[PDB]
Structures are given as structure tokens and as C-alpha cells.
């Protein structure tokens, strides 16, 4: 069981640069049997490099493999637009075929600022038995973002969950929405609600708060 480990999975490079990928293995791979796969969204993986140095037939020359022993590298000279996918490294010198963790490359653009919006639970939802409070972040490039909910000026942890959208096909920006699933009694027993958002696009974090009972 050779555990393959790769570079951080959030590698970001604008089109037209050089991409370096690492697949530091657990032990010395026999005869340098390491393969580099590529998986576009919604499809099956495809070979690019076999033997850690030779490219598969039908693969362009932008993909160059190298490395030996327990340290391997896949190099893309010019990042073409249809090359931002997830790359896996597979070792086939040992009996159990082991794939790497996989790292993905995404388009790099200028830093933006999220458009923060918060919403109160609806009356029908409130009478359904639970109250959901959601605040949204719109059109921010750096995927890293933290949302901290404040209920009655208190920190709430674990009582929330968030989802993100994929990279936009027009301006290459993300969007985040975090929901505060709260019971009816707990929602009605508190006064103020707010979520704190931290991003490198804003030096001073912005907190948007609403008070239950008025619109």
C-alpha cells in the first residue's frame, strides 16, 4: 500500500504559464511505474504520462513528465484553456493500484470583493417547524473565505453548513452561501443575527446584521 501524496489541491495559475505537479510517494516505486491521469468534469480519467517520462499516444507535447524514486513531477509548459482539470498520479509497480489524492488547476484573476447579502426566514418556513437563516457571498475570486455566524452577539460553531459553486465560465469567480439551520424556539428566543465574512479583498471584515420583527 504505497500512499501517494500530491501538492495542495488548490493550485491556481492564469493561462499561459508553467504548471508543476508533485506526487511524492511513500516508497521507491519499482521501475518508475508512475502514470499521470487527467479527469475533466463529468468524464473518466485519461492518461497523459506513462512510465513517469513518456507521453501516451495522442497526447500533445505540452505535458512533460520527470522524476524518479519517490519524487515525481508533471510539467505543463503552456496552460491551454482546455487543461484546467484534476490530475491524478497512479503507481502500477505494486499489486494494489494506488491513485494519488489529485490536484486541480483553476484560472487566476484579479482579486474581487464578495457582495454580502443576508435573509430572514420566511413565515411558512417558520411555521413548518424550523428556521433557516442564510447569508450569501457573490462574485469573489479567491476561493478561501470564512463565514462566522453571530446569534445574540455570540459565536455559533457547528450549527451551520455552507456550499460553493464551481468556477464561473464567464468571469472565473466563485459564490458562497452559508445557512444557519435553527429551531423555531431557538430562533424566536434571540434578538439579533449576523454573519461575519473575512476575505483578502477587504482589509476590514464586514458584518451584515438584521433584527427579527421588522422589515
Amino acid at each position: 500500500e504505497i500512499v501517494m501524496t500530491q501538492s495542495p489541491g488548490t493550485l491556481s495559475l492564469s493561462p499561459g504559464e508553467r504548471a508543476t505537479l508533485s506526487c511524492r510517494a511513500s516508497q521507491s516505486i519499482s521501475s518508475s511505474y508512475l502514470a499521470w491521469f487527467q479527469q475533466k468534469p463529468g468524464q473518466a480519467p485519461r492518461l497523459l504520462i506513462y512510465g513517469a517520462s513518456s507521453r501516451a499516444p495522442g497526447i500533445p507535447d505540452r505535458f512533460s513528465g520527470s522524476g524518479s524514486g519517490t519524487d515525481f513531477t508533471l510539467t505543463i509548459s503552456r496552460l491551454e484553456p482546455e487543461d484546467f482539470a484534476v490530475y491524478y498520479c497512479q503507481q502500477y509497480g505494486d499489486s494494489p493500484l494506488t491513485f494519488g489524492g489529485g490536484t486541480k488547476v483553476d484560472i487566476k484573476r484579479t482579486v474581487a470583493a464578495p457582495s454580502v447579502f443576508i435573509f430572514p426566514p420566511s413565515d411558512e418556513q417558520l411555521k413548518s417547524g424550523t428556521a433557516s437563516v442564510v447569508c450569501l457571498l457573490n462574485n469573489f475570486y479567491p476561493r478561501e473565505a470564512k463565514v462566522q455566524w453571530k446569534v445574540d452577539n455570540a459565536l455559533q460553531s457547528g450549527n451551520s453548513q455552507e456550499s460553493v459553486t464551481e468556477q464561473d465560465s464567464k468571469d472565473s469567480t466563485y459564490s458562497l452561501s452559508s445557512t444557519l439551520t435553527l429551531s423555531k424556539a431557538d430562533y424566536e428566543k434571540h434578538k439579533v443575527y449576523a454573519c461575519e465574512v473575512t476575505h483578502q479583498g477587504l482589509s476590514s471584515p464586514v458584518t451584515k446584521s438584521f433584527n427579527r420583527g421588522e422589515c
Partner: protein
């Protein structure tokens, strides 16, 4: 140039037995090893096992006590039978050649959950005063508590497409998913036009046309 095709039961319940089949077309089927590869979110690609026309099988040591495979030389088919599936076996299953170097399958998403089919209960998302930031707003209609994964959300019967952000479904601790869909519009557009989101869900045949009221 083989054309592997897959089929099997998508939804499953805990403690059942997963069963998938992969059909081989094209060139010769005998004298080869056929692999099953499992890809799961959070984890990575995982190799399950191999089988040839003679019935010889190789198994991953981790998934060795639950994996059973059979090959049908008569119809050029091989099958996988994962036994006692838990909630951690929700993944995408592929069939490929022995090493998955030449030709792969298409993928068969298999989800293991103990929940009956439920229809979504769409809720409005009122644009508050803070949402009206002069020239931009933030509408939406939260879609909550539906069990089957595929739910499609539109806006104004497809008239509105710019700014729509349908976030991925999230499995909460009740066995049912939750989805959100939002759109940004100018305040004058709010005061001069009506917006409805046409949430629909095939496994329950429930389509709703909730209108967001400011």
C-alpha cells in the same frame, strides 16, 4: 476500441448488496483482466479488483471480505457485487481494462441512503433593505427536504439566466437534501417585473411556481 457500457441500481439501502454490470463491445474480450475503480468525494480514486474470462480474481486487500465478482463469457459481461453496503460506499463506479490505461467506462453513480422519496418544499427568500444595495439585489427560493438528488431550478420559465447561481445540494442530518438558487437584479427591475422560480422534481412529479414577494 472497446465501448464499455455500465448499468445497475443507483439508489440503495444500508445492509443491502450493490450489484453493477459492465458490458464489453468492440475487440476481443478473452485474454484480458477487467477492473472496477471507485471514485468518491472526499477520498480519491480507489481500485476494487480484477477478473478475467477464466474466473481468476484479484481483490484489493482493504475491500476483500465484501467484494465478489463474476464473469459471463457467453454475453461478454462481468459484474461486481459489493456486500453489506454502508453509507460510506456512496461513490462513482467505473469499469476499465486491467490497469485503466487504455479504455474506461462511463461511470455509475451509486448512493446508499435510508430514506423514502420526498417532494421539495420551496420557500421564498425576501430581499430585505440590506439586499437592496442601490443597484443590486439578491433574490432566491430555498429548496429544502427532498430525498432524490436531481432537482432543477429555473427562473421566470427560463427567461432569466444571467446571475443565476444554483448552489450544489447539501445532505443534512435528516437524510434529505437542501438546495439554494439565487439571482441578482436591479431595484427598478424588482419594482417593474415579477419573478418566479420553477422548481421541479421528477421522482415526486412535484413542480412549484413560487413567487418571491419583496
Amino acid at each position: 476500441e472497446v465501448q464499455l457500457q455500465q448499468w445497475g441500481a443507483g439508489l440503495l439501502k444500508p445492509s443491502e448488496t450493490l450489484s453493477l454490470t459492465c458490458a464489453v463491445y468492440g475487440e476481443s474480450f478473452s485474454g484480458y483482466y477487467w477492473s472496477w475503480i471507485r471514485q468518491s468525494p472526499g477520498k480519491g480514486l480507489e481500485w476494487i479488483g480484477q477478473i478475467n474470462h477464466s474466473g481468476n480474481t484479484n481483490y484489493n486487500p482493504s475491500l476483500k471480505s465484501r467484494v465478489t465478482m463474476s464473469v459471463d463469457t457467453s454475453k461478454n459481461q462481468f459484474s461486481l457485487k459489493l456486500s453489506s453496503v454502508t453509507a460510506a460506499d456512496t461513490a462513482v463506479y467505473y469499469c476499465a481494462r486491467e490497469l485503466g490505461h487504455d479504455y474506461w467506462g462511463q461511470g455509475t453513480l451509486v448512493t446508499v441512503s435510508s430514506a423514502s422519496t420526498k417532494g421539495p418544499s420551496v420557500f421564498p427568500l425576501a430581499p430585505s433593505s440590506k439586499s437592496t444595495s442601490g443597484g443590486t439585489a439578491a433574490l432566491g427560493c430555498l429548496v429544502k427536504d427532498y430525498f432524490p438528488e436531481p432537482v432543477t431550478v429555473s427562473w421566470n420559465s427560463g427567461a432569466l439566466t444571467s446571475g443565476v447561481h444554483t448552489f450544489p445540494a447539501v445532505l443534512q442530518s435528516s437524510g434529505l437534501y437542501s438546495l439554494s438558487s439565487v439571482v441578482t437584479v436591479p431595484s427598478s427591475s424588482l419594482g417593474t417585473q415579477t419573478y418566479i422560480c420553477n422548481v421541479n422534481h421528477k421522482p415526486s412529479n412535484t413542480k412549484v411556481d413560487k413567487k418571491v414577494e419583496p
